[PDB]
């Protein structure tokens, strides 16, 4: 999913923790890039 920006959950395993962190950073960067592209 490319839409969710915040996920409130304390993970236990570092693997999924980092996967989640990268997913959220990715989605926020999609936000950043579309804010940059729409700037004419």
């Amino acid at each position: 999913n490319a839409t969710l920006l915040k996920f409130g959950y304390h993970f236990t395993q570092q693997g999924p923790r980092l996967r989640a962190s990268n997913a959220m950073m990715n989605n926020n960067d999609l936000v950043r890039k579309r804010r940059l592209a729409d700037l004419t």
Binding site: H10, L18, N22, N28, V31, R35
Partner: protein
């Protein structure tokens, strides 16, 4: 005209304030409290949390969570709650007209710094922000340029050596043993005298006991024998419900884990051995200057026996023709913040900020090319 903000988000406490001052304005515990699952109190119509002093005051009906574990931000929504609380409720300021200085421990994940930049620029949007290493700020507050900083807080204990402004990252040492582990060990060893502290509300009581009554012995075995002989080392503490407890050797057995980690089952070495190993991993021509400049910072370094014990241990490990000097100022609990206030007040630093235009143009990766 715009005043800069200095915020230090450690594992246990948040120290936030304005640049150019002497002491932080807002010092509050870095906890988020959520409703208990016991249906005792349901009448409190809040949103979904309490943060900081409000969570600590109402802790009898709350579950308390630390957003940061071992110097790493594990939950980011709770971190957003902490930053919102320290911007709007504690400092009583609007973030859009103040640059912000943040701190980070060495050998942390890069993603942590990237998400700090992203949150500060997209949710609490600042004109500029800058992330700095904590030990460099401690050395800034100490007034000198060469030295090895032992920074011990609530989640991590790290040694960083710096010589003439150059850091040596291959000799940076990190030990996951700090104040919270000592709190847990004190909770474990108070069961020997019949006192049972289990819940997270009692963990703060045990933390208060540790902050008020514990100290570091110069010789551990002699002080254990002295405690076993006479009741001169015993102190009394009054609980919030009026009960009075007495503790003896537990005053000095608790911080001794910093020098003997095997008390809690860790295979690592003590802080003195770690400091000596950090000194031995550097070049031979700078070790003498590191020996005379051992700088202590952090709240875990506030026990009133730790400088003399560290000096004795390091002098035992180092050659006898060396001057070992431990530098323990009285205000070392807030040295990182003091260094941040020093750093944010320099006229030569104002061109090193990361403006919003640069973040828009480059993204959340300019924090590696701009911040050390």
């Amino acid at each position: 005209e715009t005043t800069a903000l200095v915020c230090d988000n450690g594992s246990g406490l948040v120290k936030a304030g304005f640049a150019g001052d002497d002491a932080p304005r807002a010092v509050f515990p870095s906890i988020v409290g959520r409703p208990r699952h016991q249906g005792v109190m349901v009448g409190m119509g809040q949103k979904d949390s309490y943060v900081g002093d409000e969570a600590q005051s109402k802790r009898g009906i709350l579950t308390l969570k630390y957003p940061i574990e071992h110097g790493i931000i594990t939950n980011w929504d709770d971190m957003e709650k902490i930053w919102h609380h320290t911007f709007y409720n504690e400092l009583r300021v609007a973030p859009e007209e103040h640059p912000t200085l943040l701190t980070e421990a060495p050998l942390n994940p890069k993603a942590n710094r990237e998400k700090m930049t992203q949150i500060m620029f997209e949710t609490f949007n600042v004109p500029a922000m800058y992330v700095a290493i904590q030990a460099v700020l401690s050395l800034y507050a100490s007034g000198r340029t060469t030295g090895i900083v032992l920074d011990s807080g609530d989640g991590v204990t790290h040694n960083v050596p710096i010589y003439e402004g150059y850091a040596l990252p291959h000799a940076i040492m990190r030990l996951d043993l700090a104040g919270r582990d000592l709190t847990d060990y004190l909770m474990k060893i108070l069961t020997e005298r019949g006192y049972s502290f289990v819940t997270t509300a009692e963990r703060e009581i045990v933390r208060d006991i540790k902050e008020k009554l514990c100290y570091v012995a110069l010789d551990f075995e002699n002080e254990m024998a002295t405690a076993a002989s006479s009741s001169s080392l015993e102190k009394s503490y009054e609980l919030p419900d009026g009960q009075v407890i007495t503790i003896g050797n537990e005053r000095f057995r608790c911080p001794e884990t910093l020098f003997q980690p095997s008390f809690i089952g860790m295979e690592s070495a003590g802080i003195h051995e770690t400091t000596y190993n950090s000194i031995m991993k550097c070049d031979i021509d700078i070790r003498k200057d590191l020996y005379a400049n051992n700088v202590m910072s952090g709240g875990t370094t506030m026990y009133p026996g730790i400088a003399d014990r560290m000096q004795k241990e390091i002098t035992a490990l180092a050659p006898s023709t060396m001057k070992i000097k431990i530098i323990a100022p009285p205000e070392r609990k807030y040295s990182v913040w003091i260094g941040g206030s020093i750093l944010a007040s320099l006229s030569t630093f104002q061109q090193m900020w990361i403006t919003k235009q640069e973040y828009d143009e480059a993204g959340p990766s300019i924090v590696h090319r701009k911040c050390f």
